[PDB]
Design a protein around this ligand. Sequence first.
Ligand SMILES: O=C1CC[C@H](Nc2ncnc3[nH]c4cc(F)ccc4c23)C(=O)N1
Length: 167
Amino acid sequence: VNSFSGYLKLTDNVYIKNADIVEEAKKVKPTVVVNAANVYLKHGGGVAGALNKATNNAMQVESDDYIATNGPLKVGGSCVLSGHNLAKHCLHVVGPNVNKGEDIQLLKSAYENFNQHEVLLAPLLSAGIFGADPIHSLRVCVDTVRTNVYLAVFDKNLYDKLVSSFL
Ligand SMILES: O=C1CC[C@H](Nc2ncnc3[nH]c4cc(F)ccc4c23)C(=O)N1
């Protein structure tokens, strides 16, 4: 039993809700919140910009030190950093950005990072400003993640479409 509330159950392990991931994280304080990161951990917009703003830019400060030490992530890769005031940990995961020409096949590799964590609050990878089809992202999530994932979808219209079209 966990503290997530109001989710629709899609499969044995995947749950979905129309919610602002920032507000959901502040309420649940999950062990792991997933950020829709880029390889530079520059949290400018989309989910990343919103999560970073909610930390009063502390996420960005921590991230800049991480990059100065380690260099950029790989597309499809991840790193674990602090969750600040939102969660115990933040798993920064880099899905391919279609608006940069990156290979959508890397979306499965990106979701594989979730399997290192028993329970996660997460957005749909590569959705929103990353330019992929969110219906496809949900399919890859369900077919790749085996741990318990609670998906927050900000847009109510998109949420209804994701549910109604789910196979
Ligand atoms: O760009 C996108 C849009 C679709 C989906 N985004 C989100 N998912 C969940 N909660 C969210 N809260 C936000 C707060 C913001 F200010 C901006 C974006 C989001 C957002 C995604 O995957 N990427």
